[PDB]
Design a protein around this motif. Structure first.
Motif, PDB file in Angstrom:
ATOM      1  N   UNK A  52       0.860  -1.167   0.000  1.00 32.45           N
ATOM      2  CA  UNK A  52       0.000   0.000   0.000  1.00 32.45           C
ATOM      3  C   UNK A  52       0.901   1.223   0.000  1.00 32.45           C
ATOM      4  N   UNK A  53       0.480   2.285  -0.678  1.00 31.89           N
ATOM      5  CA  UNK A  53       1.178   3.573  -0.582  1.00 31.89           C
ATOM      6  C   UNK A  53       0.201   4.733  -0.427  1.00 31.89           C
ATOM      7  N   UNK A  54       0.644   5.785   0.245  1.00 33.56           N
ATOM      8  CA  UNK A  54      -0.128   7.017   0.326  1.00 33.56           C
ATOM      9  C   UNK A  54       0.675   8.128  -0.337  1.00 33.56           C
ATOM     10  N   UNK A  55      -0.017   8.968  -1.101  1.00 35.06           N
ATOM     11  CA  UNK A  55       0.588  10.059  -1.872  1.00 35.06           C
ATOM     12  C   UNK A  55      -0.168  11.367  -1.641  1.00 35.06           C
ATOM     13  N   UNK A  56       0.513  12.387  -1.141  1.00 38.39           N
ATOM     14  CA  UNK A  56      -0.126  13.682  -1.020  1.00 38.39           C
ATOM     15  C   UNK A  56      -0.419  14.221  -2.421  1.00 38.39           C
ATOM     16  N   UNK A  61       2.592  15.138 -10.428  1.00 40.71           N
ATOM     17  CA  UNK A  61       2.668  15.901 -11.671  1.00 40.71           C
ATOM     18  C   UNK A  61       1.497  15.530 -12.568  1.00 40.71           C
ATOM     19  N   UNK A  63      -1.079  11.877 -14.004  1.00 40.38           N
ATOM     20  CA  UNK A  63      -1.501  10.490 -13.875  1.00 40.38           C
ATOM     21  C   UNK A  63      -1.854   9.834 -15.203  1.00 40.38           C
TER      22      UNK A  63
END
Lengths: 74, 61, 89, 72, 74, 65, 70
Positions: A52-56, A61, A63
């Motif tokens: 899992x990852x979280x991205x602010x 830039x 998607x």
């Protein structure tokens, strides 16, 4: 349709996020909010496989969406 | 307002001086652009989401 | 809220816009918004080298946040109005 | 049961702290106080690039560019 | 209060520092909290590494506030 | 919030920070603003700090470890 | 607690440091919620070299890293 709505319904799809950093992130989308903060599963990041990852939002830039996109949400 | 540009093809200049050509499909108040059939000439993608932060300039062609 | 008013008083005027990335664009101010986004009609090239990679396109949306300067002519602007309104804020 | 970060900053008040900017700068001095925006008041702060200055008195350090806080 | 002491110099020559080693001098016509600015009869100097280039704009340049660092008098 | 940080606590996490900083630590505490409290903090710029607080507003990315 | 500070040191001599590393020594005339400062002070600390001397100055609050007394 609006970017945010598009993401909101693209939940469960695969996509490729570019960071301001220069990092590519390949994952399946799990959650989005109004700031465009993202959580992704089944993740691979390129300068590494993760659960899992979280991205602010402010650090994205652009998607790359799967071409399916239009038909899948709508 | 970018409204007159919906569904038309556009030139996009990013702040870093890069240049794109696409179909402008969606756009929000923060200038998040929703794009289709994009090219940077090598095609980048059929659908892509772009952050308002990155946008310097939109042009109607 | 003031500079919005000002720009509204500048519509149909020819202006030269300089963006941060060393890009320079002449044109007719057709629209202005709250972010000070600009819309130009009849895009043209003021300078030989800075000018970006265009041609056929005649209308642009410029993001406010990316402009450094807007170039104006003493004729386009009432100074005293400006001054007392600035005082007013 | 959760440990709130602002509570962690609160207890390091009157202690020595290292404040690590998002840049290559760092400040160590006594933590006098902080607000909700995590602006920060330091006392007699050493300024480093990773020794630039010895400050004497009170420094307001803009929370804007703060990245890490380190008690001690 | 710092923004009022700026009203103080209206119609008074001013010296302005901007990010990217550029400096403007001109007559203050207008400013906003964002420290957006209109100036007239203004000369800009750009220092690029050492040479300095100049640029004149007598009629009335507007300046986006976010690039502005310092606002004083020459 | 979209990320449930509750699972992570007592777990080792990897946080990228705006400005090119990496931090790896043990998630001890967090808030709604995404400020964190990390334990055994090592900052890859090897740099070892201890019990740190990380400002949520510059919190750019977060994975496990 | 920071506001009390802003009001405590007005009229004292302060160093204000900007994001760029430039530093401004002067007397604190005022300061608002957005970190805007009223300075009119010299731009050089001393050893490196004094770069400007200006009597009255305004420092944009987004750029300020700190405001410190001596």
């Amino acid at each position: 349709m609006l970017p945010l709505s598009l993401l909101k319904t693209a939940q469960n799809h695969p996509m490729l996020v570019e960071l301001k950093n220069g990092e590519t992130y390949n994952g399946h989308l799990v959650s989005c909010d109004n700031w465009m903060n993202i959580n992704l599963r089944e993740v691979i990041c390129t300068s590494w496989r993760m659960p899992e990852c979280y991205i602010r939002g402010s650090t994205i830039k652009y998607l790359r969406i799967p071409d399916e996109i239009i038909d899948m949400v709508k | 307002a970018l409204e007159n540009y919906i569904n038309r093809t556009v030139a996009v200049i990013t702040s870093d001086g890069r240049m794109i050509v696409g179909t402008l499909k969606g756009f929000d108040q923060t200038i998040n652009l929703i794009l289709d059939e994009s090219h940077e000439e090598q095609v980048v993608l059929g659908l892509y989401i772009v952050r308002g932060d990155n946008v310097a300039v939109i042009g109607e062609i | 809220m003031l500079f919005y008013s000002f720009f509204k008083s500048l519509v149909g005027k020819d202006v030269v816009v300089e963006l941060k990335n060393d890009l320079s664009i002449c044109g007719t101010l057709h629209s202005v918004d709250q972010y000070l986004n600009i819309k130009l009609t009849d895009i043209s090239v003021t300078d030989p080298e800075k000018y970006p990679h265009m041609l056929s396109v005649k209308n642009c949306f410029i993001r406010g946040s990316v402009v450094r300067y807007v170039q104006l002519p003493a004729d386009e602007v009432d100074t005293q109005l400006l001054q007392d309104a600035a005082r007013k804020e | 049961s959760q440990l709130l970060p602002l509570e962690l900053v609160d207890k390091c008040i009157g202690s020595r702290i290292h404040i690590v900017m998002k840049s290559d700068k760092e400040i160590v001095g006594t933590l006098l106080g902080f607000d909700d925006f995590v602006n920060m008041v330091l006392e007699d702060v050493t300024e480093f690039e990773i020794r630039r200055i010895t400050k004497l008195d009170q420094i307001l350090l803009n929370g804007n560019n703060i990245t890490m806080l380190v008690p001690g | 209060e710092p923004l009022d002491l700026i009203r103080l110099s209206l119609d008074e020559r001013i010296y302005v520092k901007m990010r990217n080693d550029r400096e403007l001098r001109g007559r203050l016509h207008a400013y906003d909290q964002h420290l957006n600015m209109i100036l007239g009869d203004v000369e800009e100097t750009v220092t690029t590494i050492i040479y300095k280039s100049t640029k004149r704009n007598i009629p009335m340049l507007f300046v986006r506030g976010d690039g502005v660092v310092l606002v004083a008098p020459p | 919030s979209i990320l449930d940080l509750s699972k992570y606590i007592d777990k080792t996490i990897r946080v990228k920070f705006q400005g090119g900083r990496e931090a790896s630590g043990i998630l001890k505490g967090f808030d709604p603003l995404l400020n964190l409290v990390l334990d055994g903090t090592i900052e890859y710029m090897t740099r070892q700090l201890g019990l740190v607080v990380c400002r949520g507003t510059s919190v750019v990315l977060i994975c496990p470890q | 607690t920071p506001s009390d500070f802003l009001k405590q040191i007005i009229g004292r001599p302060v160093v204000v440091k900007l994001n760029s590393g430039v530093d401004y020594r002067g007397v604190l005339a005022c300061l608002d919620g957005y970190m805007n400062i009223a300075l009119e002070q010299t731009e050089e600390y001393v050893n490196g070299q004094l770069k400007n001397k200006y009597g009255d100055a305004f420092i944009r609050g987004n750029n300020v890293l700190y405001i410190s007394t001596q």
